[PDB]
Each structure stands twice: as C-alpha cells, then as structure tokens.
Amino acid sequence: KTEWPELVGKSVEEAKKVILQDKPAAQIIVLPVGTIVTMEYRIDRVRLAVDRLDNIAQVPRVG
Amino acid sequence: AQSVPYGVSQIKAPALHSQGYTGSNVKVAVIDSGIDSSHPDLKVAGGASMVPSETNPFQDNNSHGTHVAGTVAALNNSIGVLGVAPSASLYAVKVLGADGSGQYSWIINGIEWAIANNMDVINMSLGGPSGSAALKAAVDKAVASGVVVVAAAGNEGTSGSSSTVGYPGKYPSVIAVGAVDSSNQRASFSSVGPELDVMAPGVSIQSTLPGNKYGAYNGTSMASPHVAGAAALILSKHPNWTNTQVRSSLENTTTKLGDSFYYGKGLINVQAAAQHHHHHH
Ligand SMILES: [Ca+2]
Ligand code: NA
C-alpha cells in the first residue's frame, strides 16, 4: 500500500492514524497544500498536504 | 582519495574534464534548502536566503540542498566525491526551510535574486503539483534573461496516460529532468508526461551531506543537478552559447532510451552536447 486516495477530505488526524496502521514506521510530515517541496524520494516518508481547515487536500503517497 | 560517483561518469562528464573544462567562471544557483559552506568538498561563492525564519543560506538544516550542490559542483581534489562541474561558482539560494518546504513567494524571490545576480544556471530540485502565474512569470523571466533553468520532473511515477510532471518543471521554459538508474532504466518514482525533457542518474547518487558527510540519495532531485552541472560544463567550453543553445545541445545529443512519455529524449551525454555538431548516440 503506497497511496491513500480514500483519505482526501479527511482530517489530518484520521489520515495519520490510517497511514500508521498500514505503514507503522512512516515518517509523516504535514505541510500546507500549495507549498513547494524537495524532490528526493524517501521510501519511509509520507507527506500530508492540508487545507486551511487541517483536512487532507491531496492524495497522500509514499516518497 | 576522491571517488567519482557513477552518475558523473554515466553522463560523460569526465570527457569534458579531460578536455580541460570543469565549469570555471560559470555561476550556478542551487535554489534549495541552503548549502553547508563548511563542507571541505564544496566551495560556495555566494548566495542569499529568502526563508524568513532561516536567514543564513550557508546553513543547510535539511541536507537536501547540500547533496544537490555536491552533484553540481563537489570539488576536484583528493577527498569525497567529484561534481559534474567541479569549478563552477556555486550559489546557495535558500528558499526551503529545514523541513524541506517553501512558500511559492520564497521560490520566486530566489529566482529573482538569481536573475539580479547574473546567474548562468538555476537548478530547482523542488516542485509542487500546481503552478501559479507568478511562478511561471519568474521562470520565464529568468529564461528571457539568458539563464539556463533546470528542475526535477517530480517523483509521482505513472498515472495511466496522465502527465505527472510537477511545477516548475512542467513549464515549457524549464528543462524537466527525470531519473534513471545505472542501467538506464527509468526509476519507478520518476514523473512522466510529454513535459519530460531529458533523463539523468537519480538512483543511489552519492554526494556531500552537512557536517562533512557523504551519502547516497534517490530522486529526480538528484537527476536535475547532473543536468545543471552539464549546462555549466558546456558553458565553460562555449562561454558565448546562449541558454537556448545549451538547452538544445543537451536535448539534441541524448542517448535515446524508451518512449518519450517515460524517458523524454533520453539520457544526457555532455560529451556529445559540448561538440559543435550535435546528434544522438
Ligand atoms: Ca572531491
Ligand atoms: Na518544462
């Protein structure tokens, strides 16, 4: 499991809980949607992109 | 003893080095998370930070900008790694904080700094899924001003027949670079789409890390600086070539790999790019 499209529109809290069930060693970083980020690929990382309400705004994926 | 990372060899940079061309007097901005200027295998010529809470561009609290910089320009000596353009004048243009993120205006401010400071090449190992008009204007302005602008294609992998190249790589004026490994196979994470321009090594790429370390990273972030460094080599051999001509030289001399949707024009070959007459090998 490397992408979580069912998490879009959920709270950042539920998204972290679900991703850590699927990938308990995940390194989760939360950032505002519409920011620019580094393009290295980290198999252990899952970035979360949140809207101004702290809901998931883009499909989380590993990288 | 120094080691030459495989990706530097794979793009044929040693052929330029043996001709005597190493990126001397070419100004390359690494628009990124900073560059650790204390690293003994890097020489940072200047820079600026556009990160409000991290005002020193010579302190890299993430590690990413340092790694990218070493691929562009790690020094030619008896230590560490060798960069693609080891004599380039390297500028730390810090637009990302410790967490590897930046606001669009910070990136734009860095691009503006680079234009105002007469940079010859910009490398942006960075990106986002959406554009903005102001971002597009900044990169187009840089290109109109003569700067070779290179960026990571993105690490989105495939999505059916959709393009997954992010911005600013997705803009026509920016050279979007995807990642291959040492066998010239596209990395599975490498973004795809008609905006993919060229490929370079982006798997298990050894380079400089903060606090006098080295390590192997993966990403289109690692591929992009092979191309920015190649642009600096070509400009050191042909100092009057415009950005238009450097970009076409790199595009016109790739080693073609697969379908262009997945590979763009193929793997860069800086030896062939820096000849007067260009063809694919
Ligand atoms: Ca060295
Ligand atoms: Na482009």
CSV table of C-alpha atoms and ligand atoms in Angstrom, one decimal:
chain,number,residue,atom,x,y,z
A,1,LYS,CA,0.0,0.0,0.0
A,2,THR,CA,1.7,3.2,-1.1
A,3,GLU,CA,-1.1,5.8,-1.8
A,4,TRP,CA,-4.2,6.7,0.2
A,5,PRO,CA,-6.8,8.4,-2.2
A,6,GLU,CA,-9.6,7.4,0.3
A,7,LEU,CA,-8.0,9.9,2.8
A,8,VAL,CA,-8.6,13.0,0.7
A,9,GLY,CA,-11.1,15.3,2.6
A,10,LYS,CA,-10.5,13.5,5.9
A,11,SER,CA,-9.0,15.2,8.9
A,12,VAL,CA,-5.2,15.2,9.2
A,13,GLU,CA,-5.7,13.2,12.5
A,14,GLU,CA,-7.6,10.3,10.8
A,15,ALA,CA,-5.1,10.3,7.9
A,16,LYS,CA,-2.1,9.9,10.3
A,17,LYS,CA,-3.9,7.1,12.2
A,18,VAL,CA,-4.7,5.2,9.0
A,19,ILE,CA,-1.3,5.6,7.4
A,20,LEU,CA,0.4,4.4,10.6
A,21,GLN,CA,-1.8,1.3,10.6
A,22,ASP,CA,-0.7,0.5,7.0
A,23,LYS,CA,2.9,1.7,7.5
A,24,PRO,CA,3.8,1.8,11.2
A,25,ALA,CA,7.3,3.1,10.5
A,26,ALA,CA,6.2,6.0,8.3
A,27,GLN,CA,7.8,9.4,8.8
A,28,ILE,CA,4.8,11.8,8.5
A,29,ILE,CA,5.3,15.4,7.7
A,30,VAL,CA,2.3,17.8,7.5
A,31,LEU,CA,2.5,20.8,5.1
A,32,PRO,CA,0.0,23.4,3.8
A,33,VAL,CA,-1.3,22.5,0.4
A,34,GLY,CA,0.3,24.7,-2.3
A,35,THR,CA,3.8,24.7,-0.9
A,36,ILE,CA,6.9,23.7,-2.8
A,37,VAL,CA,9.0,20.8,-1.5
A,38,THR,CA,12.2,18.9,-2.1
A,39,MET,CA,12.1,16.2,-4.8
A,40,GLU,CA,14.2,13.5,-3.2
A,41,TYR,CA,12.4,10.1,-2.8
A,42,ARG,CA,12.2,8.7,0.7
A,43,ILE,CA,10.6,5.3,0.9
A,44,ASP,CA,9.9,5.8,4.7
A,45,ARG,CA,8.2,9.2,4.3
A,46,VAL,CA,4.6,10.2,3.8
A,47,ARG,CA,3.9,13.9,3.4
A,48,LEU,CA,0.4,15.2,4.1
A,49,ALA,CA,-0.9,18.2,2.3
A,50,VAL,CA,-3.5,20.1,4.3
A,51,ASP,CA,-6.0,22.8,3.5
A,52,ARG,CA,-6.6,25.8,5.8
A,53,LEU,CA,-9.1,23.7,7.8
A,54,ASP,CA,-6.5,20.9,8.5
A,55,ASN,CA,-8.2,18.4,6.2
A,56,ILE,CA,-6.3,16.4,3.6
A,57,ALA,CA,-6.3,18.2,0.3
A,58,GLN,CA,-4.2,15.9,-1.9
A,59,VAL,CA,-3.7,12.1,-2.2
A,60,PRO,CA,-1.1,11.1,0.3
A,61,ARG,CA,1.6,8.8,-1.1
A,62,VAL,CA,4.9,7.3,-0.1
A,63,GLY,CA,8.0,9.4,-1.1
B,1,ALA,CA,41.3,9.5,-2.4
B,2,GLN,CA,38.4,11.0,-4.3
B,3,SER,CA,35.7,8.8,-5.9
B,4,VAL,CA,33.7,9.6,-9.0
B,5,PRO,CA,30.0,8.8,-8.4
B,6,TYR,CA,28.7,6.6,-11.2
B,7,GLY,CA,26.2,9.2,-12.4
B,8,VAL,CA,29.0,11.7,-13.2
B,9,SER,CA,30.7,9.0,-15.4
B,10,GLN,CA,27.4,7.9,-16.9
B,11,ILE,CA,26.6,11.4,-18.3
B,12,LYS,CA,30.3,11.5,-19.7
B,13,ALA,CA,31.4,14.5,-17.7
B,14,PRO,CA,34.9,13.0,-17.4
B,15,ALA,CA,35.3,13.6,-21.2
B,16,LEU,CA,34.8,17.3,-20.6
B,17,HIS,CA,37.2,17.3,-17.6
B,18,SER,CA,39.9,15.6,-19.7
B,19,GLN,CA,39.4,18.4,-22.4
B,20,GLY,CA,40.1,20.8,-19.5
B,21,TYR,CA,36.6,22.1,-19.0
B,22,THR,CA,35.1,22.0,-15.4
B,23,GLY,CA,32.5,24.8,-15.3
B,24,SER,CA,35.1,27.6,-14.4
B,25,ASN,CA,33.5,31.1,-14.2
B,26,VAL,CA,30.0,29.7,-14.6
B,27,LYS,CA,27.5,30.9,-12.0
B,28,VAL,CA,25.1,28.2,-10.8
B,29,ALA,CA,22.4,28.9,-8.3
B,30,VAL,CA,21.2,25.9,-6.3
B,31,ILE,CA,17.7,27.1,-5.3
B,32,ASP,CA,17.1,24.8,-2.5
B,33,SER,CA,17.4,24.3,1.3
B,34,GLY,CA,20.8,26.1,1.6
B,35,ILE,CA,24.3,24.7,1.2
B,36,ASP,CA,26.6,23.8,4.0
B,37,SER,CA,29.5,26.0,3.1
B,38,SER,CA,31.8,24.4,5.7
B,39,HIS,CA,31.9,21.2,3.8
B,40,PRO,CA,35.5,20.6,2.7
B,41,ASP,CA,34.4,19.2,-0.6
B,42,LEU,CA,32.3,22.3,-1.6
B,43,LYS,CA,33.2,25.9,-2.3
B,44,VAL,CA,30.2,28.2,-2.1
B,45,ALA,CA,30.8,31.5,-3.9
B,46,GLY,CA,27.8,33.5,-2.6
B,47,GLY,CA,24.1,33.3,-2.0
B,48,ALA,CA,21.0,34.7,-0.1
B,49,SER,CA,18.2,33.3,2.0
B,50,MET,CA,14.5,34.0,1.2
B,51,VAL,CA,13.4,31.9,4.2
B,52,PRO,CA,12.1,34.4,6.8
B,53,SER,CA,13.0,32.3,9.9
B,54,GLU,CA,16.3,30.9,8.4
B,55,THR,CA,18.4,33.8,7.3
B,56,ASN,CA,21.7,32.0,6.7
B,57,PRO,CA,21.8,30.4,3.2
B,58,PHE,CA,25.2,28.7,4.2
B,59,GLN,CA,23.5,26.7,6.8
B,60,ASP,CA,21.6,23.7,5.5
B,61,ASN,CA,19.3,22.3,8.2
B,62,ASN,CA,17.6,19.8,5.8
B,63,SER,CA,20.7,18.2,4.0
B,64,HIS,CA,19.0,18.2,0.5
B,65,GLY,CA,20.5,21.4,-0.9
B,66,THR,CA,23.9,20.3,0.1
B,67,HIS,CA,23.5,16.9,-1.6
B,68,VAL,CA,22.2,18.6,-4.8
B,69,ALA,CA,25.1,21.1,-4.7
B,70,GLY,CA,27.7,18.3,-4.5
B,71,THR,CA,26.3,16.7,-7.6
B,72,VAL,CA,26.6,20.1,-9.4
B,73,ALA,CA,30.0,21.1,-8.1
B,74,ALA,CA,31.8,18.9,-5.5
B,75,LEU,CA,35.4,20.0,-5.7
B,76,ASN,CA,38.2,18.2,-7.7
B,77,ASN,CA,40.7,17.2,-5.1
B,78,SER,CA,41.8,14.1,-3.1
B,79,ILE,CA,38.6,13.7,-1.0
B,80,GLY,CA,35.0,12.8,-1.1
B,81,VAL,CA,33.1,12.9,-4.5
B,82,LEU,CA,33.7,14.8,-7.7
B,83,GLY,CA,31.0,17.0,-9.0
B,84,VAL,CA,29.9,17.3,-12.7
B,85,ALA,CA,31.2,20.9,-12.9
B,86,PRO,CA,33.8,21.0,-10.0
B,87,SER,CA,35.0,24.5,-10.8
B,88,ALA,CA,31.5,26.1,-11.1
B,89,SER,CA,30.8,29.2,-8.9
B,90,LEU,CA,28.2,27.8,-6.6
B,91,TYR,CA,25.5,30.0,-5.1
B,92,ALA,CA,23.3,28.9,-2.2
B,93,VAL,CA,19.9,30.4,-2.8
B,94,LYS,CA,17.9,29.2,0.2
B,95,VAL,CA,14.2,29.1,-0.4
B,96,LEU,CA,13.3,25.9,1.6
B,97,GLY,CA,13.5,25.6,5.4
B,98,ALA,CA,14.7,22.6,7.5
B,99,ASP,CA,11.5,20.7,6.8
B,100,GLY,CA,12.2,20.8,3.0
B,101,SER,CA,9.3,23.1,2.2
B,102,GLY,CA,8.9,26.7,0.9
B,103,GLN,CA,6.2,29.1,0.1
B,104,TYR,CA,5.7,30.0,-3.7
B,105,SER,CA,6.8,33.6,-3.0
B,106,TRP,CA,10.1,32.3,-1.4
B,107,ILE,CA,10.9,30.3,-4.5
B,108,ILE,CA,10.0,33.3,-6.7
B,109,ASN,CA,12.2,35.6,-4.6
B,110,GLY,CA,15.1,33.2,-5.1
B,111,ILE,CA,14.6,33.1,-8.9
B,112,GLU,CA,14.5,36.9,-8.9
B,113,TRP,CA,17.7,37.1,-6.8
B,114,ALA,CA,19.4,34.7,-9.3
B,115,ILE,CA,18.4,36.9,-12.3
B,116,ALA,CA,19.5,40.1,-10.4
B,117,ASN,CA,22.8,38.4,-9.6
B,118,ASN,CA,23.6,37.3,-13.2
B,119,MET,CA,23.5,33.5,-12.6
B,120,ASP,CA,24.1,31.5,-15.7
B,121,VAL,CA,22.2,28.4,-14.5
B,122,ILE,CA,19.5,27.7,-12.0
B,123,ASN,CA,18.8,24.3,-10.5
B,124,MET,CA,15.5,23.7,-8.8
B,125,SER,CA,15.4,20.2,-7.3
B,126,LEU,CA,11.9,21.1,-6.0
B,127,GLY,CA,8.3,21.2,-7.1
B,128,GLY,CA,4.6,21.2,-6.5
B,129,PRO,CA,1.6,19.7,-8.1
B,130,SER,CA,0.0,23.1,-9.2
B,131,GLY,CA,1.5,26.1,-10.9
B,132,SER,CA,1.0,29.8,-10.3
B,133,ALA,CA,1.0,32.7,-12.8
B,134,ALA,CA,3.7,34.4,-10.7
B,135,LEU,CA,5.8,31.2,-10.6
B,136,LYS,CA,5.5,30.9,-14.4
B,137,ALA,CA,6.4,34.5,-14.9
B,138,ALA,CA,9.6,34.1,-12.7
B,139,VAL,CA,10.9,31.2,-14.6
B,140,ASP,CA,10.0,32.7,-18.0
B,141,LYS,CA,11.7,35.9,-16.9
B,142,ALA,CA,14.9,34.0,-16.0
B,143,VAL,CA,14.9,32.3,-19.4
B,144,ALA,CA,14.2,35.6,-21.3
B,145,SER,CA,17.2,37.0,-19.3
B,146,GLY,CA,19.5,34.2,-20.6
B,147,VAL,CA,19.6,31.8,-17.6
B,148,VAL,CA,19.5,28.0,-18.2
B,149,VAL,CA,16.7,26.8,-15.9
B,150,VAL,CA,16.7,23.1,-14.8
B,151,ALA,CA,14.3,21.4,-12.5
B,152,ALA,CA,13.4,17.9,-11.2
B,153,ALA,CA,10.5,16.4,-13.2
B,154,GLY,CA,8.8,15.1,-10.0
B,155,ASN,CA,8.6,11.7,-8.2
B,156,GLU,CA,4.9,11.0,-9.0
B,157,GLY,CA,5.5,7.9,-11.0
B,158,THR,CA,2.8,6.9,-13.6
B,159,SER,CA,-0.9,7.6,-13.6
B,160,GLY,CA,-2.3,6.0,-16.6
B,161,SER,CA,-2.0,8.3,-19.6
B,162,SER,CA,-1.9,11.5,-17.5
B,163,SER,CA,1.2,13.6,-17.2
B,164,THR,CA,2.6,13.6,-13.6
B,165,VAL,CA,5.4,16.2,-14.1
B,166,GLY,CA,5.1,18.9,-11.4
B,167,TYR,CA,5.9,22.6,-11.5
B,168,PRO,CA,8.1,24.4,-12.3
B,169,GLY,CA,9.4,21.5,-14.4
B,170,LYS,CA,6.1,21.4,-16.3
B,171,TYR,CA,6.6,24.9,-17.7
B,172,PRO,CA,7.9,24.9,-21.4
B,173,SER,CA,10.7,27.3,-20.4
B,174,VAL,CA,12.2,25.0,-17.8
B,175,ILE,CA,14.1,21.8,-18.6
B,176,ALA,CA,12.3,19.0,-16.7
B,177,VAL,CA,14.6,16.1,-15.7
B,178,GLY,CA,13.5,12.6,-14.9
B,179,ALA,CA,15.6,9.8,-13.1
B,180,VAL,CA,17.2,6.7,-14.4
B,181,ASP,CA,19.5,4.2,-12.7
B,182,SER,CA,22.9,2.9,-13.7
B,183,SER,CA,21.4,0.6,-16.3
B,184,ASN,CA,19.4,3.5,-17.9
B,185,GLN,CA,16.1,2.2,-16.6
B,186,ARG,CA,13.7,4.8,-15.5
B,187,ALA,CA,13.2,4.8,-11.7
B,188,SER,CA,9.7,3.8,-10.8
B,189,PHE,CA,9.1,7.0,-8.9
B,190,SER,CA,10.2,9.2,-11.9
B,191,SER,CA,7.3,11.5,-13.1
B,192,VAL,CA,6.2,11.0,-16.7
B,193,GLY,CA,4.4,13.1,-19.4
B,194,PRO,CA,5.0,15.0,-22.6
B,195,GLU,CA,6.8,17.7,-20.5
B,196,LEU,CA,9.5,15.2,-19.5
B,197,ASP,CA,12.5,16.6,-21.4
B,198,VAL,CA,15.7,14.6,-20.5
B,199,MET,CA,16.8,12.0,-18.0
B,200,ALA,CA,19.9,11.8,-15.8
B,201,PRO,CA,21.1,9.4,-13.0
B,202,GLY,CA,18.8,9.7,-9.9
B,203,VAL,CA,19.1,6.4,-8.1
B,204,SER,CA,21.7,5.8,-5.3
B,205,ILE,CA,23.5,9.0,-6.0
B,206,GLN,CA,26.5,9.7,-3.7
B,207,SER,CA,27.1,13.3,-2.8
B,208,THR,CA,28.0,15.7,0.0
B,209,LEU,CA,25.9,16.0,3.2
B,210,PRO,CA,26.1,18.6,6.0
B,211,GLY,CA,28.7,18.2,8.7
B,212,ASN,CA,31.4,16.8,6.4
B,213,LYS,CA,29.4,13.6,5.4
B,214,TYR,CA,28.5,11.9,2.2
B,215,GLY,CA,25.6,9.6,1.3
B,216,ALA,CA,23.5,8.1,-1.4
B,217,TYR,CA,20.1,9.8,-2.1
B,218,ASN,CA,17.4,9.0,-4.7
B,219,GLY,CA,15.1,11.3,-6.6
B,220,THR,CA,14.5,13.4,-9.6
B,221,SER,CA,16.1,15.9,-7.2
B,222,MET,CA,19.4,14.0,-7.8
B,223,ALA,CA,18.9,13.8,-11.6
B,224,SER,CA,18.3,17.6,-12.1
B,225,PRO,CA,21.8,18.7,-10.8
B,226,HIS,CA,23.5,16.3,-13.3
B,227,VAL,CA,21.9,18.5,-16.0
B,228,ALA,CA,22.5,21.8,-14.3
B,229,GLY,CA,26.2,20.7,-13.8
B,230,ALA,CA,26.3,19.6,-17.5
B,231,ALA,CA,25.0,23.0,-18.5
B,232,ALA,CA,27.9,24.6,-16.6
B,233,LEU,CA,30.4,22.3,-18.3
B,234,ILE,CA,29.0,23.2,-21.8
B,235,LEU,CA,29.1,27.0,-20.9
B,236,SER,CA,32.7,26.7,-19.7
B,237,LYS,CA,33.7,25.2,-23.1
B,238,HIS,CA,31.4,27.6,-25.1
B,239,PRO,CA,31.1,30.8,-22.9
B,240,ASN,CA,29.1,32.6,-25.6
B,241,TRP,CA,26.5,29.9,-26.2
B,242,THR,CA,23.1,31.2,-25.1
B,243,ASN,CA,20.8,29.3,-22.8
B,244,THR,CA,18.7,28.4,-25.9
B,245,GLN,CA,21.8,26.8,-27.4
B,246,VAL,CA,22.9,25.0,-24.2
B,247,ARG,CA,19.4,23.6,-23.8
B,248,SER,CA,19.2,22.4,-27.4
B,249,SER,CA,22.7,21.0,-27.2
B,250,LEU,CA,21.6,18.8,-24.3
B,251,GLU,CA,18.3,17.8,-25.9
B,252,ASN,CA,19.8,17.1,-29.4
B,253,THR,CA,22.6,14.7,-28.1
B,254,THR,CA,20.8,12.5,-25.6
B,255,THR,CA,21.1,8.7,-25.8
B,256,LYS,CA,17.5,7.8,-26.7
B,257,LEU,CA,16.0,5.3,-24.2
B,258,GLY,CA,12.4,4.3,-24.5
B,259,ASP,CA,9.1,6.0,-25.3
B,260,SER,CA,9.4,9.8,-24.7
B,261,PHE,CA,6.4,9.8,-22.4
B,262,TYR,CA,8.5,7.8,-19.9
B,263,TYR,CA,12.1,8.8,-20.9
B,264,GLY,CA,11.7,12.2,-22.7
B,265,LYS,CA,14.6,12.5,-25.1
B,266,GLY,CA,16.8,10.0,-23.1
B,267,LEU,CA,19.9,10.2,-21.1
B,268,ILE,CA,22.1,13.4,-21.3
B,269,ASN,CA,25.5,13.0,-22.8
B,270,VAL,CA,27.6,16.2,-22.0
B,271,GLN,CA,30.5,15.0,-24.2
B,272,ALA,CA,28.3,15.0,-27.3
B,273,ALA,CA,26.4,18.2,-26.2
B,274,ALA,CA,29.7,20.1,-26.0
B,275,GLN,CA,30.8,19.3,-29.5
B,276,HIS,CA,29.8,21.8,-32.3
B,277,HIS,CA,27.8,19.3,-34.2
B,278,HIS,CA,25.0,17.5,-32.4
B,279,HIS,CA,23.4,14.1,-32.9
B,280,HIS,CA,22.0,11.4,-30.6
B,281,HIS,CA,24.2,8.4,-29.7
C,1,CA,CA,36.3,15.9,-4.2
C,2,NA,NA,9.5,22.0,-18.9
